[PDB]
Design a protein that fits this description.
CATH architecture of chain A: 3-Layer(aba) Sandwich
Shape of chain A: globular
Number of helices of chain A: 6
Strand content of chain A: 15-25%
Largest interface: A-B, 21 and 21 residues
CATH topology of chain A: Molybdenum Cofactor Biosythetic Enzyme, Chain A
Order of helices and strands of chain A: EHHEHEHEHEEH
Radius of gyration of chain A: 14 Å
Number of strands of chain A: 6
Helix content of chain A: 40-55%
Structural class of chain A: alpha/beta
Oligomer: homotrimer
CATH superfamily of chain A: MoaB/Mog-like domain
Chain lengths: 162, 162, 162
Amino acid sequence: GPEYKVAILTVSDTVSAGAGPDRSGPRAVSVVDSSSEKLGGAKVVATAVVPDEVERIKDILQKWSDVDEMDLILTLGGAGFTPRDVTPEATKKVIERETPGLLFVMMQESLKITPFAMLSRSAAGIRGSTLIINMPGNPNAVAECMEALLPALKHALKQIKG
Amino acid sequence: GPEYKVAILTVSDTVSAGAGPDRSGPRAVSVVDSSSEKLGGAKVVATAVVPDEVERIKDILQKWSDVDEMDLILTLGGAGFTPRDVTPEATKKVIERETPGLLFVMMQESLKITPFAMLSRSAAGIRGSTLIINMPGNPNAVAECMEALLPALKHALKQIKG
Amino acid sequence: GPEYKVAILTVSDTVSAGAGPDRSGPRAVSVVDSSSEKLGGAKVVATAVVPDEVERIKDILQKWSDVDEMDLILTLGGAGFTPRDVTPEATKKVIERETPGLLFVMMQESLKITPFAMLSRSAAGIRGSTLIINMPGNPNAVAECMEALLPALKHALKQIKG
């Protein structure tokens, strides 16, 4: 069906333990769905929630990439200065080829909105033919980051296939 | 009893040999005192001088992080193109979690003053609960960097903390 | 002879298999010459063509740096999202000290021209006394990249020398 399969992974001890709801996952889904056309026809086919533990985060990025063959994986949360925030360190263990331009743009554009954006420690890269991008836990943030990436994201997914 | 303990590491073969006064060290200290309130009550409680040798740099960063439990270490010097400049490589070996946002802002703002800022090779990150940031050797640089980071550095330290 | 020896490595399956010409090499050469004065008298004394293979790329970056003692290697291509593009992964295995500010500037400046600049995965750094800078595969790009760095590239090369 979908030209590009997208999966969104929410990282949060609080959500994962049933102690709270996921306010970022829906919005993330909603932004991808709303931009399907500019993304060359992409659709979120899976979401999941892990806690702030690297091995849990690694296993999913691995599975989604190697086995389910997702084309785009966004992570939400676990990428700030909190002691538990380990999303980037797990992300960095699984990508094969880094994509610093995407990080640069996310940081450049979100700084225009607030200096607290410098607290984002996001990683991004390519494993196999999957693009993986770390994004922040705030709901407003995915929208801000996806607006920033949108001009090039379709061309990026196109190039990873060839 | 300061809320956040800051420590300042001067890196310079020259200074460490006694061949000259430390110019960067004290000024740096003076900047932090000056910004104490904006930093949520941070104060320098220790300095040290080392030469341009990775092992010595690693040892003090390690000991200040692991044993003295400093909240903020700023290195000054050893982060340019000169053959002996190895501060960032030392730093990279001791941090656990990178914080590229701090490098981006320092780099974005310093470029507005001069294109020679592109020669800063600063690294930065977190080891345990210690934030570590490489800053240049010029005395005026510390202050320009501190001004650039100041809007978010209070919120950074409070997040590391708990 | 030349105050600074520059070498240009062109990375491309197509070019290396004699299935197409090098349109980037020549511009790169041309830009360096046209910029000899501002680079404190530099000159391209070698070029080569390798395919998209990490070992073939490392071998030359290693040889030019360690044996020929070049002072400035530029690479052209293999630094985007295509499956075969491994120039940056090659480059990172050989440099000893990274130079994130050259990357920050090349990205910042080229983003002003187009958002597809975010797809550049360039790396850059120093091995021995050799500056290594990745650049994109378009001919226009080397010129845009070199305009961004030229203000400081002289001081950089002078600082590596001693």
